[PDB]
Design an enzyme around this catalytic site. Sequence first.
Site, PDB file in Angstrom:
ATOM      1  N   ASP A 175       0.830  -1.211   0.037  1.00 25.16           N
ATOM      2  CA  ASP A 175       0.035  -0.209  -0.015  1.00 25.16           C
ATOM      3  C   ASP A 175       0.859   1.354   0.023  1.00 25.16           C
ATOM      4  OD1 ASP A 175      -1.849  -2.181   0.161  1.00 25.16           O
ATOM      5  OD2 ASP A 175      -2.826  -1.086   1.991  1.00 25.16           O
ATOM      6  N   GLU A 199      -1.157 -10.086  10.604  1.00 25.06           N
ATOM      7  CA  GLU A 199      -0.895  -9.900   9.314  1.00 25.06           C
ATOM      8  C   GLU A 199       0.556  -9.125   8.924  1.00 25.06           C
ATOM      9  OE1 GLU A 199      -3.344  -6.101   8.668  1.00 25.06           O
ATOM     10  OE2 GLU A 199      -2.912  -5.725   6.698  1.00 25.06           O
TER      11      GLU A 199
HETATM   12  N1  WAS Z   1      -9.201   1.846   9.312  1.00 24.84           N
HETATM   13  N2  WAS Z   1      -9.538   1.309   8.275  1.00 24.84           N
HETATM   14  N3  WAS Z   1      -9.271   2.008   7.119  1.00 24.84           N
HETATM   15  C1  WAS Z   1      -9.940   1.496   5.742  1.00 24.84           C
HETATM   16  C2  WAS Z   1      -9.319   1.641   4.437  1.00 24.84           C
HETATM   17  C3  WAS Z   1      -9.866   1.179   3.185  1.00 24.84           C
HETATM   18  C4  WAS Z   1     -10.689   0.214   3.241  1.00 24.84           C
HETATM   19  N4  WAS Z   1     -11.233  -0.312   1.958  1.00 24.84           N
HETATM   20  C5  WAS Z   1     -10.362  -0.681   0.874  1.00 24.84           C
HETATM   21  C6  WAS Z   1     -10.427  -2.210   1.023  1.00 24.84           C
HETATM   22  O1  WAS Z   1      -8.982  -2.630   1.013  1.00 24.84           O
HETATM   23  C7  WAS Z   1      -8.492  -2.841   2.149  1.00 24.84           C
HETATM   24  O2  WAS Z   1      -9.044  -3.814   2.817  1.00 24.84           O
HETATM   25  N5  WAS Z   1      -7.208  -1.999   3.103  1.00 24.84           N
HETATM   26  C8  WAS Z   1      -5.931  -1.907   2.482  1.00 24.84           C
HETATM   27  C9  WAS Z   1      -5.314  -2.897   3.120  1.00 24.84           C
HETATM   28  N6  WAS Z   1      -4.432  -3.928   2.344  1.00 24.84           N
HETATM   29  C10 WAS Z   1      -3.803  -5.029   3.062  1.00 24.84           C
HETATM   30  C11 WAS Z   1      -4.640  -6.029   3.219  1.00 24.84           C
HETATM   31  C12 WAS Z   1      -5.075  -6.719   1.919  1.00 24.84           C
HETATM   32  O3  WAS Z   1      -5.496  -5.634   1.132  1.00 24.84           O
HETATM   33  C13 WAS Z   1      -5.930  -7.951   2.291  1.00 24.84           C
HETATM   34  O4  WAS Z   1      -5.383  -8.704   2.805  1.00 24.84           O
HETATM   35  C14 WAS Z   1      -3.771  -7.101   1.080  1.00 24.84           C
HETATM   36  O5  WAS Z   1      -4.331  -7.350  -0.158  1.00 24.84           O
HETATM   37  C15 WAS Z   1      -2.857  -5.960   0.845  1.00 24.84           C
HETATM   38  O6  WAS Z   1      -1.794  -6.256   0.182  1.00 24.84           O
HETATM   39  C16 WAS Z   1      -2.463  -5.518   1.988  1.00 24.84           C
HETATM   40  O7  WAS Z   1      -1.629  -4.436   2.148  1.00 24.84           O
HETATM   41  C17 WAS Z   1     -11.301  -0.164   4.454  1.00 24.84           C
HETATM   42  N7  WAS Z   1     -12.549  -1.004   4.654  1.00 24.84           N
HETATM   43  O8  WAS Z   1     -13.204  -1.017   5.576  1.00 24.84           O
HETATM   44  O9  WAS Z   1     -12.743  -1.947   3.575  1.00 24.84           O
HETATM   45  C18 WAS Z   1     -10.783   0.494   5.668  1.00 24.84           C
END
Ligand code: WAS
Length: 765
Positions: free
Chosen positions: A538, A735
């Site tokens: 990210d 994670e």
């Molecule tokens: N405080 N909360 N803020 C927040 C911000 C965005 C979002 N929605 C975007 C949906 O994307 C995500 O979930 N987040 C990115 C994190 N990515 C991680 C994990 C993973 O994405 C899955 O294991 C791996 O693939 C990635 O490599 C790894 O870096 C949500 N939400 O509630 O969906 C909540």
Amino acid sequence: LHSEIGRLNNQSLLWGPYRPNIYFGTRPRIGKSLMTGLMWGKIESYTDFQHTVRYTCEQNEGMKGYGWDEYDPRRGGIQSIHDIQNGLDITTSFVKIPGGAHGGSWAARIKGTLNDDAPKDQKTIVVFYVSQEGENSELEAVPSENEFGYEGDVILKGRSEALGNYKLVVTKGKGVIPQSDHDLSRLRGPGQTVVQSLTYPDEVLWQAKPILFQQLKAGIDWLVENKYDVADPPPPWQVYLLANKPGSGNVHIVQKVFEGDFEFDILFSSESAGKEVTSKDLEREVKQATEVFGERFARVFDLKAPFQGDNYKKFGKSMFSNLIGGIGYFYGHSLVDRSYAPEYDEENEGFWEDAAEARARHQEALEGPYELFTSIPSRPFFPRGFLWDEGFHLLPIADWDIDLALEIIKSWYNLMDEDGWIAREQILGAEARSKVPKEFQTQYPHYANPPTLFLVLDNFVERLRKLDETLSTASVDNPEVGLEYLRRLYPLLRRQFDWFRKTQAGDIKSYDREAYSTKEAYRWRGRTVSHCLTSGLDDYPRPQPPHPGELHVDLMSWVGVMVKSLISIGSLLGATEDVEFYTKVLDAIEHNLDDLHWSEKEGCYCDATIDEFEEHKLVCHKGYISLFPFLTGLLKPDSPKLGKLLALIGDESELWSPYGLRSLSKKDEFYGTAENYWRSPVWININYLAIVQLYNIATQDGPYKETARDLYTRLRKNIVETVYRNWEETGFAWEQYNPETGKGQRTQHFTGWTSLVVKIMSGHH
Ligand SMILES: NNNc1ccc(NCCOC(=O)NCCN[C@H]2C[C@](O)(CO)[C@@H](O)[C@H](O)[C@H]2O)c([N+](=O)[O-])c1
């Protein structure tokens, strides 16, 4: 015989607890069909149950832990729930009995044991919720002999085109059922199992909690109406016991109240099979399943030194079972922006402001329905398909049951649109949408994601080169079957390859850029000032400001991964015209990685941009990105570049922590800054790639052989011990891991690519 194996696989995998988003529930791999769910909660007061009741998965201070002790989707398994809030340790055993024409039968046992802190006489409400979608299907509770509810078993009779004739029984069960001396018992009974049969429009059946509460509320309303009050109130548990009204509908609520410990069984009997399923059946199959799981584990995940001990074996079984037990089935619409606004092309300086404006138009629409069968990163936080995650989830799953992994790949590839795009996050249906804020649901056809599923395909190819037991390996034992699979899949892989080259292309020819090939350069679409979500990594630091001239060395390397598999598979299919094109692209990427991405000065790979004065500048942030060409398997075993990377990986003052490789160097200015997500913590997926590549060099003659052997040995050790210590202390896979303290941080129950640790322990890649 290919079609034969496909039908056998269909029949084998149809039923499962394919609802990972909830503690416990079953559904078959059919979009509109029968679904079950478990709810429970202690009741101590008039207002507590609504806060105590459990249904969808969460992780907070009130829940100690939960997960599958053993699981095989073909057979079933056992799940342990440790609930502090409700003072309960719960067991859910689930087992499949093949037979008939409709995908077999199954049974579950639900067992609840009060922990030591619980009042010995705690009242616990337990609900089994049953729904069926479909236009031409039927489901009916056989009414009870007794007035007010059930002394014995509850039998539901149903039928549909998908399932034929079936019966679902909720048994009487063992445990004290409390009795009320209240006046109310004259109208509601003294206390007994009850059933309410209802009907709602199909699309809301999934909202079990509100449906149940709407019934409880109407029960209470009825009390108030009929003059039951605080002069003399019935006991709480009686106030929350539904009036018995069995019948027919598309929703059936079975409710039980227990005092003390309890257990009950659910038996689903396909009528097309033998005789109906019994409790004695369930116990037999549970015992049998355990033995079968045990034996397979020892063959497939044979842990090597120093992890042979029983402690690491329990640890391995826990990481494996929870990864494979995440497998879910999803069905429904997705939310896609299909505008293809020109601003998404990202051709201007400042493009991020443009693309925000395009997003602000909100042209997204639901489309589908779609279906996906997939494992998930996290039951409580991420219960849906994620593209590059699945690449990692399938690596251990493939060892266990190659036919299962191929099923999940087929499922994923069946989602690809005509352009060759698969959304990186698969949010299918209102139920999946319910846990995701609106702002984050929309997928974008320009957003890519690492093609990690090619890695799994590679493992399949090499295995292909060199009844449940039979099914699990049928696709490698029967080479004609293997090949046909690849034949059908091959076109879609190729489409994806091309889609990358069309949508994720970098700009060589428009700049003062000298390089071996004019074709080969890649830039991830979707980047903001602060983030590049599409790369997977990210907030790993990238060129500032973002710029249409960026090239990303990770993306180019992924392209290399794809070409290498496209060569391997193309060869097997004799697609020679293709295989020759691939070879020229591989050749170009190899040269171009050096020409465009190598920093002689820093001794690693870097991302590029274009200057204030329009010249190509390398931007080096020493970290995971820097090793990409290595992690993805592209560098020859004798390369001086490789040797320089081995120095980088080994160096304690850069990446090498006692706990694993840091995502970013301690020397980098961006270390531990901002949200510090991929800017220092240890991530197992990338560590896994390194461990695999180090092993390759170690087991092959060459100049770096014994240095790699040293790194391999220590890194395997470090990663496993980090994930293990944390599992021992907290009960969870995490994670990422803190490079200073070794502590697990961010999301819990991350199984999830953290589970790769099973494959690291078992070794012999
Ligand atoms: N405080 N909360 N803020 C927040 C911000 C965005 C979002 N929605 C975007 C949906 O994307 C995500 O979930 N987040 C990115 C994190 N990515 C991680 C994990 C993973 O994405 C899955 O294991 C791996 O693939 C990635 O490599 C790894 O870096 C949500 N939400 O509630 O969906 C909540």
